Amino acid sequence: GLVPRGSHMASHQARVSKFDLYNSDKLDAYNQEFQVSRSNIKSINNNGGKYNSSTIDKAIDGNLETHWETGKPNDANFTNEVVVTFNEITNIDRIVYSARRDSARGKGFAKEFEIYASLKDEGDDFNLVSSGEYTESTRDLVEIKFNPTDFKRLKFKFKKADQNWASAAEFMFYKEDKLNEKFNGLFTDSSMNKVSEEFNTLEKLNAFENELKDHPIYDLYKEGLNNARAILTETSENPTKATLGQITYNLNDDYNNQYRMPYKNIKAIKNNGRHYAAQNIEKAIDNDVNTYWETGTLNSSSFNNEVEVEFNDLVTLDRIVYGSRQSDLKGFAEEVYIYASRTSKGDTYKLVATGAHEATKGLVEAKFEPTEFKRVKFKFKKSKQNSATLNELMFYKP
């Protein structure tokens, strides 16, 4: 699902975020209502010519796999710009843009940009609409969001282009989507751990959900709405004590079928350290007691190792089963801190359980009270030899 991008009002700094909507089957439906049709894009020009056959028209041909590239890169004296002319004066609030997507994908990405408007067909009467930047990645298809503005001509300036050779796979234009912008303001800030005032009760939130039901990408809003709901209904952090002990029931296939969360419920895994050699994080969840992750950063006086696993579906767990590397036992979580989040994204973790067990071969369970998990954090509060290793990390239900 979609994650709220934060509210934008403009001073005139554009909100730039990854355009994840492209990976959805709802795109055609969304484009139907909000996209400025390509048939409305009359013509295009630019001030820097073109490299080889990467002609400027290829920037607005509706094909992400064809690109324009400038013939003259940015330097101290020259800034690449593109000017799109529309059939009629068109109200636009968003540009969806990608750099070239060939073998040199990302090269020429508009790391910094300015957007200008003209209501006339000719002459330099352009006024500045919005300035923006995107530092995350050069390879991304990004949504650039600014104040809804009338354009006969839209000028896009490559204030900073990655490696100077400005490129564009596509420039796409969208009309204002008020409900989408309402969704984007669901949380107070980028940490998304506090619901905004206009949705800060279940009554308000549920009514908002109902308001969105006819929206073409309503299905993609559900995750964010559920996230807000989880926050609104969250109970105070009251960590219990986890009883740890050696177990062997992981061998029991039938038992696993009933009580172990399916491995395919794991959306992603990450950790706060790196990893020593080729003992990467993914082999902590490969269902192989012989392969193990090892940390690339040991437990300092000010540092604990912690591993984070995201789930597709929220699940209620009472046990987390783990083991160290079986050769040495170096990195056995002698003392464990377990954190639960009921949201898919955001700074919404809370401590649920604490426990300790001596370093031992095999697998160890950490049994606590039934807790809901959308994501889990496994912290090495105390570890053997100050390292951190996991051969397997498993999640068991009550």
Ligand SMILES: CC(=O)N[C@@H]1[C@@H](O)[C@@H](O)[C@@H](CO)O[C@@H]1O
């Ligand atoms: C494939 C590839 O990277 N091609 C690029 C080309 O598009 C242009 O940017 C050129 C500038 O000298 O550098 C490379 O050859």
Ligand SMILES: [Ca+2]
């Ligand atoms: Ca193209």
Ligand SMILES: [Ca+2]
């Ligand atoms: Ca493993």
